Paper text:
Cyclophilins (CYPs) are ubiquitous proteins involved in a number of fundamental cellular functions in a large number of organisms, such as animals, plants, fungi, bacteria and viruses. Many proteins of both groups possess a peptidyl-prolyl cis/trans isomerase (PPIase) activity, implemented by the conserved FKBP- or CYP-like domain (CLD). By these isomerases the transition from cis to trans in an X-proline peptide bond, a rate-limiting step in protein folding, is stabilised or accelerated.
In the present study we have compared three similar B. napus phloem CYPs plus a homologous A. thaliana CYP by enzyme activity assays and by structural analysis to understand if the minor differences in amino acid sequences alter structural or functional features. The calculated respective RMS values for main chain atoms are around 1 Å, and the overall fold is highly similar compared to HsCYPA as well. However, Mg2+ did not show any influence on the enzyme activity. Furthermore, the crystal structure revealed a malonate molecule forming non-bonded hydrophobic contacts with Ile46 and Gly47. This binding site might interact with an unknown small organic metabolite in vivo. Due to the alanine in position 49, the hydrogen bond of the Ser49 side chain reported for CsCYP cannot be formed. The activity assays under oxidative treatment showed that this is still sufficient to provide the redox regulation mechanism via this interaction.
Numbering used by the authors:
A (entry chain X): 2 to 171
B (entry chain A): 1 to 11
Amino acid sequence: ANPKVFFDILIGKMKAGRVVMELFADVTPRTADNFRALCTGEKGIGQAGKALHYKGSAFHRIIPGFMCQGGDFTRGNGTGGESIYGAKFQDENFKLKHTGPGILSMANSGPNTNGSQFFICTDKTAWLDGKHVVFGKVVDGYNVVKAMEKVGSERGVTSEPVVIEDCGEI
Amino acid sequence: TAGLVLAXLLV
Ligand SMILES: [Mg+2]
């Protein structure tokens, strides 16, 4: 069975709720396992001397009606992040598409540059198909994602810190 | 994207 992982989200001071996500290990096992391990923190310290762990990290770029981006746990701004495989890993496949709200997909800087950054879609983002690896979807707490999305802005700056206060596997 | 944010709606 496909693993399921969670984020407990903080928006400013406020506990916003739990987002639960299913990871498509049956289609993107390598991408899924990276994300999964980053939720647990089980791989320890990486090559930048930072825990390979989403706990504490923020959704630094939120664009209402498009997506929420996070996973940059080494620099908090979109320039950092690393995979459990060592820096960046290969695009696993493009079998799955950006089919609608809730889809998890990998942020990158071009072909084969997958690290730790990801996005949760808040709409169908089909123009990204074949360039970003789709590896999961939100199955519970999508309303928490709606709430994150209200704190974001057109250019992506958030008017409140959106942070992953806790995370892990179920 | 992850480092240079560009035009349109990218990640
Ligand atoms: Mg880890």
